[PDB]
Write an enzyme that holds these catalytic residues in place. Structure first.
Site, PDB file in Angstrom:
ATOM      1  N   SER A  32       1.298  -0.956  -0.225  1.00 21.97           N
ATOM      2  CA  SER A  32      -0.010  -0.201   0.144  1.00 21.97           C
ATOM      3  C   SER A  32       1.390   1.408  -0.181  1.00 21.97           C
ATOM      4  CB  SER A  32      -0.523  -0.413   0.563  1.00 21.97           C
ATOM      5  OG  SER A  32      -1.559  -1.190   0.931  1.00 21.97           O
ATOM      6  N   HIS A  63      -9.399  -1.081  -8.877  1.00 19.66           N
ATOM      7  CA  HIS A  63      -9.366   0.785 -10.143  1.00 19.66           C
ATOM      8  C   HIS A  63      -8.096   0.846  -8.780  1.00 19.66           C
ATOM      9  CE1 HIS A  63     -10.822   1.523  -5.581  1.00 19.66           C
ATOM     10  NE2 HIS A  63     -12.418   0.452  -6.182  1.00 19.66           N
ATOM     11  N   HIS A  85      -5.133  -9.490  -1.039  1.00 19.54           N
ATOM     12  CA  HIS A  85      -4.783 -10.141   0.371  1.00 19.54           C
ATOM     13  C   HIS A  85      -5.561 -11.467   1.370  1.00 19.54           C
ATOM     14  CE1 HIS A  85      -3.208  -6.094   0.183  1.00 19.54           C
ATOM     15  NE2 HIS A  85      -2.361  -6.635   0.941  1.00 19.54           N
ATOM     16  N   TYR A  87      -7.827 -11.944   3.878  1.00 20.81           N
ATOM     17  CA  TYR A  87      -8.281 -10.946   4.382  1.00 20.81           C
ATOM     18  C   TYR A  87      -9.900 -10.342   3.063  1.00 20.81           C
ATOM     19  CZ  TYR A  87      -6.297  -6.340   2.999  1.00 20.81           C
ATOM     20  OH  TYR A  87      -6.169  -4.962   2.293  1.00 20.81           O
ATOM     21  N   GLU A  88      -9.049 -10.262   2.030  1.00 19.99           N
ATOM     22  CA  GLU A  88     -10.268  -9.863   1.104  1.00 19.99           C
ATOM     23  C   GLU A  88     -11.190 -10.563   0.843  1.00 19.99           C
ATOM     24  OE1 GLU A  88      -6.449  -7.123  -1.328  1.00 19.99           O
ATOM     25  OE2 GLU A  88      -8.652  -7.750  -2.377  1.00 19.99           O
ATOM     26  N   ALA A 115       3.191  -3.197   3.442  1.00 18.17           N
ATOM     27  CA  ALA A 115       3.224  -1.323   4.630  1.00 18.17           C
ATOM     28  C   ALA A 115       2.686  -1.827   6.044  1.00 18.17           C
ATOM     29  CB  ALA A 115       1.527  -0.580   4.825  1.00 18.17           C
ATOM     30  N   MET A 218      -0.734  -8.183   6.534  1.00 16.52           N
ATOM     31  CA  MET A 218      -1.158  -8.817   6.296  1.00 16.52           C
ATOM     32  C   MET A 218      -1.397  -9.677   4.262  1.00 16.52           C
ATOM     33  SD  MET A 218      -4.714  -6.603   7.509  1.00 16.52           S
ATOM     34  CE  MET A 218      -4.471  -5.985   9.447  1.00 16.52           C
ATOM     35  N   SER A 219       0.179  -9.428   4.506  1.00 14.81           N
ATOM     36  CA  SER A 219       0.277 -10.235   3.006  1.00 14.81           C
ATOM     37  C   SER A 219       1.902 -10.547   2.651  1.00 14.81           C
ATOM     38  CB  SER A 219       0.748  -9.032   2.320  1.00 14.81           C
ATOM     39  OG  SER A 219       1.101  -7.476   2.364  1.00 14.81           O
ATOM     40  N   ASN A 242       2.483   2.434  11.037  1.00 20.31           N
ATOM     41  CA  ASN A 242       1.885   3.304  12.154  1.00 20.31           C
ATOM     42  C   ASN A 242       3.108   1.363  13.278  1.00 20.31           C
ATOM     43  OD1 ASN A 242       1.100   0.155  11.840  1.00 20.31           O
ATOM     44  ND2 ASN A 242      -0.325   0.909  13.733  1.00 20.31           N
ATOM     45  N   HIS A 256      -3.208   2.731  10.868  1.00 15.72           N
ATOM     46  CA  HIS A 256      -2.430   3.511   9.393  1.00 15.72           C
ATOM     47  C   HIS A 256      -2.920   4.236   8.702  1.00 15.72           C
ATOM     48  CE1 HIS A 256      -5.395   2.266   5.961  1.00 15.72           C
ATOM     49  NE2 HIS A 256      -6.113   2.194   6.655  1.00 15.72           N
TER      50      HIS A 256
HETATM   51  O1  IMH Z   1      -0.102  -3.114  12.269  1.00 15.66           O
HETATM   52  C1  IMH Z   1      -0.473  -3.301  11.347  1.00 15.66           C
HETATM   53  N1  IMH Z   1      -1.492  -4.568  11.390  1.00 15.66           N
HETATM   54  C2  IMH Z   1      -1.847  -5.405  10.224  1.00 15.66           C
HETATM   55  N2  IMH Z   1      -1.242  -4.690   9.133  1.00 15.66           N
HETATM   56  C3  IMH Z   1      -1.157  -3.223   8.696  1.00 15.66           C
HETATM   57  C4  IMH Z   1      -0.761  -2.658   7.780  1.00 15.66           C
HETATM   58  C5  IMH Z   1      -1.417  -3.533   5.569  1.00 15.66           C
HETATM   59  N3  IMH Z   1      -1.322  -2.628   4.845  1.00 15.66           N
HETATM   60  C6  IMH Z   1      -2.187  -2.167   4.605  1.00 15.66           C
HETATM   61  C7  IMH Z   1      -3.226  -0.694   5.141  1.00 15.66           C
HETATM   62  O2  IMH Z   1      -3.027  -0.267   6.750  1.00 15.66           O
HETATM   63  C8  IMH Z   1      -3.181  -3.669   4.692  1.00 15.66           C
HETATM   64  O3  IMH Z   1      -2.893  -4.204   3.621  1.00 15.66           O
HETATM   65  C9  IMH Z   1      -2.445  -3.777   5.606  1.00 15.66           C
HETATM   66  O4  IMH Z   1      -1.957  -5.555   5.614  1.00 15.66           O
HETATM   67  C10 IMH Z   1      -0.411  -1.728   8.244  1.00 15.66           C
HETATM   68  N4  IMH Z   1      -0.536  -1.551   9.477  1.00 15.66           N
HETATM   69  C11 IMH Z   1      -0.945  -2.016  10.060  1.00 15.66           C
END
Ligand code: IMH
Ligand code: IMH
Ligand code: IMH
EC number: 2.4.2.1
Lengths: 288, 288, 288
Positions: A32, A63, A85, A87-88, A115, A218-219, A242, A256
């Site tokens: 991301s 998109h 992912h 999750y989707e 990310a 998550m990936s 974050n 995030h």
């Molecule tokens: O604190 C977190 N825990 C789990 N995933 C994310 C992410 C990842 N970034 C994307 C946007 O938050 C999302 O698909 C996720 O996999 C950013 N921060 C965290």
């Protein structure tokens, strides 16, 4: 693994090949806020997942989700803007489908970017963490993209993962960062993959760090696993978006939304770093 | 649990019974390299999974997977050469199907054997670890073979597992090992079940050992769970095939190829030990 | 998330609304032995899951599972006597379906109660533990009720959970307990959700406590997650039914049969406490 047959991947790679004069050597999966990396490609040729024969379409984000062929700092690349992912809803054999086809395209290296949340206290948002290892939480339980009957045409039954993230490429990267004159150091750590879309509680955040994870996302992990099964050279980065883990006062949680910065300089810096690192990916031409 | 109906198991046990004059009391599930144990059976009668009515066939390895009835050191046995694993695609209610039928065959004891990685530093490849406990990683997340609607005809809704591995049988075994005059000691520990076919990274290897697991494998736990739900006496061994957990220099990783030894003496010794242990499994005839 | 469409939930809430003059503000999900709380409702109107349009029926326990609308200590409530669990076979989007509909009913608060095992040594069976946090083991692996394509009509893609259990409501509760003149203190801790129906082994019991969990159960976490995604105020209690974690001598294990007490005073006390706590749930009428 299932859902798709070997011929499925072959029909998809064959279609891409017959549709792009491009012959990718390097596949880049943009996390991301890292999609702008595609802006760096010359001779770019875009394919919406939608258009590619057996390619999973995006659950809404189509998109944003697309495949861009082009050249990045000397390497013939294929980038996946907007990865899939768990999750989707995508079963892991759809999530990692691109990888299997990149393999049949001729891709020999895969740079994965994501990310992630900073679990290591040393990390600061904006930080780039070179992935040196991963903890595949979904995999421990059954969610391993390799689950199902194994195709020796792609790899072994029990591929090793202890050496997933190329050491050489991790040395180069570290060196590239040093030579870039980049002051803030290139962090390195273990990425822990967590599935669900909802974010971590402070308690979960604490199991993740006591487990030795430095960054949670998550990936990445699924794609890496199948890339390595394929024999591809894998290495990747994690953009710390974050920070996480404290109920001393767990109100605001730097959620995030720092994805605004994902459309900012930190993202930009990772994109640049990744682009400079193309020069460190061995050409297939023996380049020695 | 689902996928199969109680009558399914009954039709399979009934068919086996009407096809073998054999009435097994002990069921033995041979892990990798431990299939030669079948060579010890007298009055052996072989059934390819393939032939048995609702029995899951092998995903490729059928040419290894078979059910052998016979006698082993005084016990009427039924051995499963080539067990099923989650990683091959089998949902857990297929993996553990044999167990439910062994139960309806009259089997009262189940000795599970597996090939596992040594997480406990004390362990050496070749070592045999008596399973004293297990950590069911797939089960914590949802992959518990008992998931689905419970059949009181097999057992309770919430069967306890704190006492899964028979203490008596674990004492006997330990004693059998001592009396065998075996110098190297019979190791004992907790087996952590991990799903995915791909092997552990050093980071995952470290979560497994900090979790208190001594040996990691990709089987046993499901079968044990349903055996115990059935009320069967369960005890088992783990043949340590490789050692794991260090990135100090994680190049060569003694990868399971030590399966060559699985066709060797260590395997052979476990097979012998298991065979001697038949004398320690209480006869149903009150044998007191 | 899938399985059901937004309209599914809307057709179910719409049917309930057109079938009960009741407009619930508070939804209460009763754990095991806590169903008698329904006995406290005035103007009770019962609906067997069975009768409600898209409502998952019970896998056997329907003869316990029902939805009761009524009034509890000043709040318009809807109680779920006999919640759904992953272990019974329900995918998580069926388990948490009630929640999504309670949301469309107008419910703004959800109090979840469960029967759990004491991992924290401080805990004693009979103890009531205010849930301050949770570790979603099924969620880490893929079993997150939110998995699938997200409906912005219910909530975000990545809802935060670090603040799931209302602090205010947890303060009130603690205060309510103090003011009740209750001597034994209201325990507070992290609830670790475990899936499978079979009970924990001593080894698993030890990973759960080293993970920082105070109480283990097989529910609550999914409902909480979707409640919070919905924006509902969530807080809950855990009735400690058994204690767990020791192989020093792991024979009798105080197995949940303490559910006899779930038909006893401890259960009764939680039901009362929960009922008194209605006075602490902000009226939607700004109640300030
Ligand atoms: O604190 C977190 N825990 C789990 N995933 C994310 C992410 C990842 N970034 C994307 C946007 O938050 C999302 O698909 C996720 O996999 C950013 N921060 C965290
Ligand atoms: O280090 C390890 N990790 C996980 N499983 C195994 C095994 C088990 N043995 C079989 C062959 O490696 C395979 O089915 C797997 O379950 C040996 N070593 C390891
Ligand atoms: O020690 C325990 N481990 C896991 N769950 C429970 C429970 C919960 N209570 C119900 C009855 O035991 C059941 O649905 C389960 O979720 C009580 N004690 C334990």
């Amino acid at each position: 693994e299932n859902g798709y047959t070997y011929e499925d991947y072959k029909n998809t790679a064959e279609w891409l090949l017959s549709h792009t004069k491009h012959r990718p050597q390097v596949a880049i999966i943009c996390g991301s806020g890292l999609g702008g990396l595609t802006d760096k490609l010359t001779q770019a040729q875009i394919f919406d997942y939608s258009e590619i024969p057996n390619f999973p379409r995006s659950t809404v984000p189509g998109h944003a989700g697309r495949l861009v062929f082009g050249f990045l700092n000397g390497r013939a690349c294929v980038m996946m803007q907007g990865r899939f992912h768990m999750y989707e809803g995508y079963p892991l054999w759809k999530v990692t489908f691109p990888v299997r086809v990149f393999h049949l395209l001729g891709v020999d290296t895969l740079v994965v970017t994501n990310a992630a949340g900073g679990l290591n206290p040393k990390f600061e948002v904006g930080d780039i963490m070179l992935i040196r290892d991963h903890i595949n939480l979904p995999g421990f339980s059954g969610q391993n993209p390799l689950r199902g009957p194994n195709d020796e045409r792609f790899g072994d039954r029990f591929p090793a993962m202890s050496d997933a993230y190329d050491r050489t490429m991790r040395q180069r990267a570290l060196s590239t960062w040093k030579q870039m004159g980049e002051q803030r150091e290139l962090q390195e750590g273990t990425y822990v993959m967590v599935a669900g879309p909802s974010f971590e509680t402070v308690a979960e955040c604490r199991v993740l760090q006591k487990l030795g994870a430095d960054a949670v996302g998550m990936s990445t992990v699924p794609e890496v696993i199948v890339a390595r099964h394929c024999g591809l050279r894998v290495f990747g980065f994690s953009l710390i978006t974050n920070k996480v883990i404290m109920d001393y006062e767990s109100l605001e949680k730097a959620n995030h939304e720092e994805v605004l910065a994902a459309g900012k300089q930190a993202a930009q810096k990772l994109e640049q770093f990744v682009s400079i690192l193309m020069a460190s990916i061995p050409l297939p031409d023996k380049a020695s």
